[PDB]
RNA sequence: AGGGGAUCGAAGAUGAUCAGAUACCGUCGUAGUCUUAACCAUAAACUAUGCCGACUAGGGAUCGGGUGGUGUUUUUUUAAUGACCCACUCGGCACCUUACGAGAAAUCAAAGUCUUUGGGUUCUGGGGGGAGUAUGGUCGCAAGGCUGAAACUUAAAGGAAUUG
């Protein structure tokens, strides 16, 4: 079974956390990045790492991945934010209950009247 | 110390119920404390139903199951049937499934 | 200290009954709620929205009252409140916490979730109970969106809503945001329907 | 059966306080209850109370604040011999600076400091702090 | 808590729950002080000026924090209706 | 031993001393 | 070097709060020992007891060591910290720090005359942890501290001069007796004597006054 | 709760309570003036009957008893005072 | 209030109960039964002098193994026979 | 002491099992089991938790009683009934969640309102064994019930929780 230990996945996290611009869907260069950017003691463990930080990368492309957040996302969401143009005064009048109308009366004033009963 | 609030089993405001006899070993046990299953099952069974209707008269017949209530004695309930043993907590759960 | 025309306006009243913020809980009904107003038969309890509004006003009056508007904190693990709080946070100071809380946020500096606010707002003291609890380990006042069945231990100022879903929590969070800006804030005078759509706050789809 | 009517009235006040309330409805009131309520009020430990008149024996609503830790009754009304009052307040008052033991003398239902000034003695009722 | 000749002795005179006038002792880290901001003519919340209230942890635990806030703020003039002294 | 049977032990034990004492009444 | 975390930590080193009575006023939860260090340096420790405890594990016994330290001045501030580690020193190291954090105030008073500087207590006070109840009684001046050596030493560092003690329970188990005599003095500032019925305006919170001068980066 | 008017409680929540647990206690039974137009005069009846009250002159009936309130007999009327 | 009558005239009962229950006190019971004077080899007194019958070699109780060197003494005021221990190394050589 | 004696079945006798097997398991089956007349008075006769009274906190069920309704369903001609539904209110048997509070804990709406120690009252316990033994009294046909010690011995016995 090829389940990656924590030191692998923990490094992968931290690396993506702070070098997302740089790194790519390509292990081959993500490999070479690790040299210049990370200190590791063995070839094996380094490819082991970049191999997975490349995997992680590759699916951040299609949606977020819990664990890692480089704040670029939290503010990609902030400009991605908007919807609506139609809201919820159409059509006609606010349909209310018997007492809801009694509520309006017994506190306030103007409202479109549209009452309904009900049963057990 | 104590282990259940229902003590043995289900009896609050009564002082004496009345014993049943264990369906398996015949041990007496108060009816409230019994442990019970309706042994609803078919007269025929799995495979027989085809071979039932096949070599019978009438259209498909009707089919009438058997119904008999089962009374176990705790040990007998524990030795096979409904029992396991639960955690300190799961014990509290009265829900069946 | 009663403002003047900070009374419940018709446009607000319309606003609220469309969201059905006056539709309080069924049979279920915590002793500690006079925010009621005559039980609609067939198991529904109508909510005095003036008090809803009047409490909302207080809410805003205390949210805005905190030197640095950013260590005011919104919470909602309830999905229907996440898109809400993120939006409330955006417009005002306020640090947001949508999704999983993660306990030990308020005790234990050692956590990276570590906050340390002067005030807390919350959408459903059942689901968010964590927050409510942890704050009480450490004198952090709590504001809360509450229905008629919500637990009122360790929340001060209730805002009677309808966490049954839909547009209410959004509405309430909106108005919350609306009135905090309308205090010491980047807003304006009278009627002032305010540029921002109320459907901005809302749980989306599918 | 209902034994010291004083007792229930006191205990009720104490569970209102503890539960943090501001009001008690006590039942059934009495000459003595009033005169005990009357002393506490005189010294701060409760607000204003009110006799309501059911045509029966009475009810009282007491309004209290929270200056009060405890108001107990001494259930056998022991006799106290003007020396012995020192030994009472010692056993059951928090310190020598405040709190009162209230008792009952021929000269009236009074706290022990008024008892000491008036210099009379008698039976012991209860206490307030 | 003075002494022989005047002289305020004994440090630190504790706060007080504005709802039950019991002491708000130190290790009570469940207690709360709510600052309600004074406003002025047309919105405007006047930073650094509050009508304030302090509530013991006891009270909050018992759930009586809200209804007690209600009564206090209103009879201090920043709520009208909402609360009711009768039940 | 079971308390129940220790009680029986001494039930008997007394019956014998009850017996042996009678020989001497 | 220090470097705090917590609003409160920062405000302290930043010489914006001078004394704990401030912190106690607004009941601010301490969480970094250095806070009560700069705030109150006359603190001297005292390791009261050390007792071995043992756990069995699916592979090995674990006999670590439990130590009970009491810190304080002798001018109204005490601390009772209890911690177990597997080395006696690091057990004593950790406990002191918690004992710092634990530091609570004491309300002392006059047996029963208004004279020069309080020597005894304000009231009678009881503390009960586990099965021991420890009862503290105001005593006339020069009475001494009337308590077993341990509970005495805690009453002294606490700064009491004259008090009577009465104990109830299995008191030979120190860990619970001190935890109770700790509560007993910690309860002197819960007690509404008449001289405190006076109303105070209700102070403003250090956290809001030096709000700017705190806050994270 | 925690602070309320024991002295002036709302008519409604006082209404629902038991007859022995109202502020000052009092009854919840009433009296009525009952007719059966054969006659001209009107016998006063207690809301709770026990005795199956008979009219002034005619042995007619009027009401029957129950667990509580009387069952008034078919063709009748009443006011309450 | 559990148990004890709290009445103002309930002195008698309250006294009596005490007398009754003092008997569950080991020493009080011994004192009044005169157990001292009655049983007990000495008079009830502090010492007693008697005469040596045989020198004994009592084997100690576990977990100790020893021979303990004692003397059977027949008390002089009593005739009652008693076995006494003879403290310190040797010393049994002093008796006879 | 009569009756009854189907069933199951202390004792006994057996078939097996066993190193043994006076047992467990199988068979036979006496007393008994049932009833009348009279005894006996004991059970872990248990909630291992005295009774009366006050107070302290939330929730949905339910059993009995009652009150309220331009509620449902029953059709006939509407009713009247009855059963059902909803709210409330007494008083029951219980469960739920909480815990201000209590506890050595387990847990407890009492086991709470206790060193801030007092509503009224009853009863029992005071380390363990010796021992419910000896003795005397008394009740009983008996078996036994009630009352009920000491000498001597002894450093623990015991409880709740923890990790193994
Ligand atoms: Mg067991
Ligand atoms: Mg029974
Ligand atoms: Mg002979
Ligand atoms: Mg020692
Ligand atoms: Mg005895
Ligand atoms: Mg010999
Ligand atoms: Mg002689
Ligand atoms: Mg037979
Ligand atoms: Mg045999
Ligand atoms: Mg054989
Ligand atoms: Mg045999
Ligand atoms: Mg018995
Ligand atoms: Mg039982
Ligand atoms: Mg209840
Ligand atoms: Mg030994
Ligand atoms: Mg055990
Ligand atoms: Zn069985
Ligand atoms: Zn007539």
Curated annotation (Swiss-Prot), chain A:
It is found in: Cytoplasm. Keywords: Cytoplasm, Ribonucleoprotein, Ribosomal protein. The keyword Ribonucleoprotein applies. It holds the Pfam family Ribosomal_S17e. One of its GO terms (molecular function) is structural constituent of ribosome. Signal peptide: none annotated. One of its GO terms (cellular component) is cytosol. GO terms for biological process: cytoplasmic translation; ribosomal small subunit assembly. Component of the ribosome, a large ribonucleoprotein complex responsible for the synthesis of proteins in the cell. The small ribosomal subunit (SSU) binds messenger RNAs (mRNAs) and translates the encoded message by selecting cognate aminoacyl-transfer RNA (tRNA) molecules. The large subunit (LSU) contains the ribosomal catalytic site termed the peptidyl transferase center (PTC), which catalyzes the formation of peptide bonds, thereby polymerizing the amino acids delivered by tRNAs into a polypeptide chain. NCBIfam families: PRK01151.1. Belongs to the eukaryotic ribosomal protein eS17 family. Component of the small ribosomal subunit (SSU). Mature yeast ribosomes consist of a small (40S) and a large (60S) subunit. The 40S small subunit contains 1 molecule of ribosomal RNA (18S rRNA) and 33 different proteins (encoded by 57 genes). The large 60S subunit contains 3 rRNA molecules (25S, 5.8S and 5S rRNA) and 46 different proteins (encoded by 81 genes). PANTHER family: 40S RIBOSOMAL PROTEIN S17 (PTHR10732:SF0). This is Small ribosomal subunit protein eS17A. The gene is RPS17A.
UniProtKB/Swiss-Prot annotation, chain E:
It holds the Pfam family Ribosomal_S21e. One of its GO terms (biological process) is endonucleolytic cleavage to generate mature 3'-end of SSU-rRNA from (SSU-rRNA, 5.8S rRNA, LSU-rRNA). The modification N-acetylmethionine is found at residue 1. The keyword Acetylation applies. PROSITE patterns: RIBOSOMAL_S21E. Disruption phenotype: Reduction in growth rate, a decrease in free 40S subunits, an increase in the amount of free 60S subunits and a decrease in polysome size. Keywords: Acetylation, Cytoplasm, Ribonucleoprotein, Ribosomal protein, rRNA processing. InterPro entries: Ribosomal_eS21, Ribosomal_eS21_CS, Ribosomal_eS21_sf. Its main location: cytoplasm. One of its GO terms (molecular function) is structural constituent of ribosome. It is found in: Cytoplasm. N-terminally acetylated by acetyltransferase NatB. Component of the small ribosomal subunit (SSU). Mature yeast ribosomes consist of a small (40S) and a large (60S) subunit. The 40S small subunit contains 1 molecule of ribosomal RNA (18S rRNA) and 33 different proteins (encoded by 57 genes). The large 60S subunit contains 3 rRNA molecules (25S, 5.8S and 5S rRNA) and 46 different proteins (encoded by 81 genes). Belongs to the eukaryotic ribosomal protein eS21 family. This is Small ribosomal subunit protein eS21A. The gene is RPS21A.
Swiss-Prot record, chain F:
The keyword Transcription regulation does not apply. It is found in: Cytoplasm. It holds the Pfam family Ribosomal_L41. Keywords: Cytoplasm, Ribonucleoprotein, Ribosomal protein. GO terms for molecular function: structural constituent of ribosome. One of its GO terms (biological process) is cytoplasmic translation. One of its GO terms (cellular component) is cytosol. The keyword Lipid biosynthesis does not apply. InterPro entries: Ribosomal_eS32. Its main location: cytoplasm. Residues 1-25 are annotated as: Disordered. Present with 11900 molecules/cell in log phase SD medium. There are 2 genes for this protein in yeast. Component of the small ribosomal subunit (SSU). Mature yeast ribosomes consist of a small (40S) and a large (60S) subunit. The 40S small subunit contains 1 molecule of ribosomal RNA (18S rRNA) and 33 different proteins (encoded by 57 genes). The large 60S subunit contains 3 rRNA molecules (25S, 5.8S and 5S rRNA) and 46 different proteins (encoded by 81 genes). Belongs to the eukaryotic ribosomal protein eS32 family. Component of the ribosome, a large ribonucleoprotein complex responsible for the synthesis of proteins in the cell. The small ribosomal subunit (SSU) binds messenger RNAs (mRNAs) and translates the encoded message by selecting cognate aminoacyl-transfer RNA (tRNA) molecules. The large subunit (LSU) contains the ribosomal catalytic site termed the peptidyl transferase center (PTC), which catalyzes the formation of peptide bonds, thereby polymerizing the amino acids delivered by tRNAs into a polypeptide chain. This is Small ribosomal subunit protein eS32A.
UniProtKB/Swiss-Prot annotation, chain G:
Keywords: Acetylation, Cytoplasm, Isopeptide bond, Methylation, Nucleus, Ribonucleoprotein, Ribosomal protein, Ribosome biogenesis, rRNA processing, Ubl conjugation. N-terminally acetylated by acetyltransferase NatA. The keyword Phosphoprotein does not apply. Coiled coil: none annotated. One of its GO terms (cellular component) is cytoplasm. It is found in: Cytoplasm; Nucleus, Nucleolus. Its main location: cytoplasm. Residues 43-106 form the S5 DRBM domain. GO terms for molecular function: small ribosomal subunit rRNA binding; structural constituent of ribosome. Pfam families: Ribosomal_S5, Ribosomal_S5_C. The keyword Magnesium does not apply. One of its GO terms (biological process) is translation. Component of the small ribosomal subunit (SSU). Mature yeast ribosomes consist of a small (40S) and a large (60S) subunit. The 40S small subunit contains 1 molecule of ribosomal RNA (18S rRNA) and 33 different proteins (encoded by 57 genes). The large 60S subunit contains 3 rRNA molecules (25S, 5.8S and 5S rRNA) and 46 different proteins (encoded by 81 genes). Interacts with snoRNA U3. Interacts with MPP10. Component of the ribosomal small subunit (SSU) processome composed of at least 40 protein subunits and snoRNA U3. Belongs to the universal ribosomal protein uS5 family. This is Small ribosomal subunit protein uS5.
């Amino acid at each position: 079974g090829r389940v990656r230990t924590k030191t692998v996945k923990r490094a992968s996290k931290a690396l993506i956390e702070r070098y997302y611009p740089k790194l790519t869907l390509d292990f081959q260069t993500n490999k070479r990045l690790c040299d210049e950017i990370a200190t590791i003691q063995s070839k094996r463990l380094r490819n082991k790492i970049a191999g997975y930080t490349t995997h992680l990368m590759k699916r951040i492309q299609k949606g977020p991945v819990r664990g890692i957040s480089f704040k670029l996302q939290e503010e990609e969401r902030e400009r991605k934010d908007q919807y609506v143009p139609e809201v919820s005064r159409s059509n006609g009048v606010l349909n209310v209950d018997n007492q809801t109308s009694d509520l309006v009366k017994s506190l306030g004033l103007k409202l479109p009247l549209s009452v309904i009963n009900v049963s057990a | 110390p104590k282990k259940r609030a229902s003590n043995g089993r289900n009896k609050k405001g009564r002082g004496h119920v009345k014993p049943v006899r264990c369906v398996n070993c015949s041990k007496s046990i108060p009816k409230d404390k019994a442990i019970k299953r309706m042994a609803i099952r078919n007269i025929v069974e799995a495979a027989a139903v085809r071979d039932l209707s096949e070599a019978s008269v009438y259209p498909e017949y009707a089919l009438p199951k058997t119904y008999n209530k089962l009374h176990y004695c705790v040990s007998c309930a524990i030795h096979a049937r409904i029992v396991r043993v639960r955690s300190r907590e799961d014990r509290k759960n009265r829900a069946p499934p | 200290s009663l403002p003047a025309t900070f009374d419940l306006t018709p446009e607000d009243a319309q606003l609220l009954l469309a969201a059905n913020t006056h539709l309080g809980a069924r049979n279920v009904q915590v002793h500690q709620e006079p925010y009621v107003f005559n039980a609609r038969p067939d198991g529904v309890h109508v909510i005095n929205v003036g008090k809803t509004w009047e409490k909302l006003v207080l809410a805003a009056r205390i949210i805005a009252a905190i030197p640095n508007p950013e260590d005011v904190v919104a919470i909602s693990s309830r999905t229907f409140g996440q898109r809400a709080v993120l939006k409330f946070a955006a417009h005002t100071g306020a640090t947001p916490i949508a999704g999983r809380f993660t306990p030990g946020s308020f005790t234990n500096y050692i956590t990276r979730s570590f906050k340390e606010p002067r005030l807390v707002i919350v959408t459903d003291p059942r689901s968010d109970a964590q927050a409510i609890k942890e704050a009480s380990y450490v004198n952090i006042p709590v504001i809360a969106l509450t229905d008629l069945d919500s637990p009122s231990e360790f929340v001060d100022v209730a805002i009677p809503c309808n966490n049954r879903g839909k547009h209410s929590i959004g509405l309430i969070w909106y108005l919350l945001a609306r009135e905090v800006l309308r205090l010491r804030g980047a807003l304006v005078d009278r009627t002032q329907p305010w540029s921002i759509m109320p459907d901005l706050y809302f749980y989306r789809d599918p | 059966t209902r034994s010291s009517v004083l007792a229930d009235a006191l205990n009720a006040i104490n569970n209102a306080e503890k539960t943090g309330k501001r009001q008690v409805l006590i039942r059934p009131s009495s000459k003595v209850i009033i005169k005990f309520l009357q002393v506490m009020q005189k010294h701060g430990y409760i607000g204003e109370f009110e006799y309501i008149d059911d045509h029966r024996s009475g009810k009282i609503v007491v309004q209290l604040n929270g200056r009060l830790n405890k108001c107990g009754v001494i259930s056998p009304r022991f006799n106290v011999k003007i020396g012995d009052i020192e030994k009472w307040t010692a056993n059951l008052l928090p310190a020598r600076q405040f709190g009162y033991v209230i008792l009952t003398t021929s000269a009236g239902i009074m706290d022990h400091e008024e008892a000491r000034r008036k210099h009379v003695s008698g039976k012991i009722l209860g206490f307030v702090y | 808590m003075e002494n022989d000749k005047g002289q305020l002795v004994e440090l630190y005179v504790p706060r007080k729950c504005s709802a039950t006038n019991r002491i708000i002792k130190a290790d009570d880290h469940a207690s709360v002080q709510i600052n309600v901001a004074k406003v002025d003519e047309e919105g405007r919340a006047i930073p650094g000026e509050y009508v304030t209230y302090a509530l013991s942890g006891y009270v909050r635990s018992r759930g009586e924090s809200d209804d007690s806030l209600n009564r206090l703020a209103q009879n201090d003039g920043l709520l009208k209706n909402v609360w009711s002294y009768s039940r | 031993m079971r308390a129940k049977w220790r009680k029986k032990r001494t039930r008997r034990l007394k019956r014998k001393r009850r017996k042996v004492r009678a020989r001497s009444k | 070097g220090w470097v705090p975390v917590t609003k409160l930590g920062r405000l302290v080193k930043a010489g914006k709060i001078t004394t704990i009575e401030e912190i106690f006023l607004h009941s601010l939860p301490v969480k970094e020992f250095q806070i009560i260090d700069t705030l109150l340096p006359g603190l001297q420790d005292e390791v009261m007891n050390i007792k071995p405890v043992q756990k069995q594990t699916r592979a090995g016994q674990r006999t670590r060591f439990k130590a009970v330290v009491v810190v304080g001045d002798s001018n109204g501030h005490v601390g009772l910290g209890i911690k177990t580690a597997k080395e006696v020193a690091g057990a004593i190291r950790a406990g002191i720090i918690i004992a710092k954090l634990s530091v609570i105030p004491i309300r002392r008073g006059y047996w029963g005359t208004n004279l020069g500087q309080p020597h005894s207590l304000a009231t009678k006070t009881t503390g009960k942890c586990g099965s021991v109840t420890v009862r503290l009684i105001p005593a006339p001046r020069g009475s001494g501290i009337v308590a077993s050596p341990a509970v005495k030493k805690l009453l002294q560092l606490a700064g009491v001069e004259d008090v009577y003690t009465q104990s109830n329970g299995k008191t030979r188990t120190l860990e619970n007796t001190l935890k109770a005599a700790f509560v007993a003095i910690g309860n002197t500032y819960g007690f509404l004597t008449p001289n405190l019925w006076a109303e105070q305006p209700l102070p403003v919170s250090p956290l809001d006054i030096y709000s700017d001068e705190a806050s994270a980066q | 709760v925690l602070v309320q008017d024991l002295l002036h409680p709302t008519a409604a929540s006082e209404a629902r309570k038991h007859k022995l647990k109202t502020l000052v206690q009092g009854p919840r039974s009433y009296f009525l003036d009952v007719k059966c137009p054969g006659c001209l005069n009107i016998t006063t009846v207690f809301s709770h009957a026990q005795t199956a009250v008979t009219c002034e002159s005619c042995s007619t009936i009027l009401c029957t008893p129950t667990g509580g309130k009387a069952k008034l007999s078919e063709g009748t009327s009443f006011r309450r005072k | 209030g559990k148990g004890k009558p709290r009445g103002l005239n309930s002195a008698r009962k309250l006294r009596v109960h005490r007398r009754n229950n003092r008997w569950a006190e080991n020493n009080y019971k011994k004192r009044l039964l005169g157990t001292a004077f009655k049983s007990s080899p000495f008079g009830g007194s502090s010492h007693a002098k008697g005469i040596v019958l045989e020198k004994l070699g009592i084997e100690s109780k576990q977990p100790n193994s020893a021979i303990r060197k004692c003397v059977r003494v027949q008390l002089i005021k009593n005739g009652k026979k008693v076995t006494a221990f003879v403290p310190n190394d040797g010393c049994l050589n002093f008796v006879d």
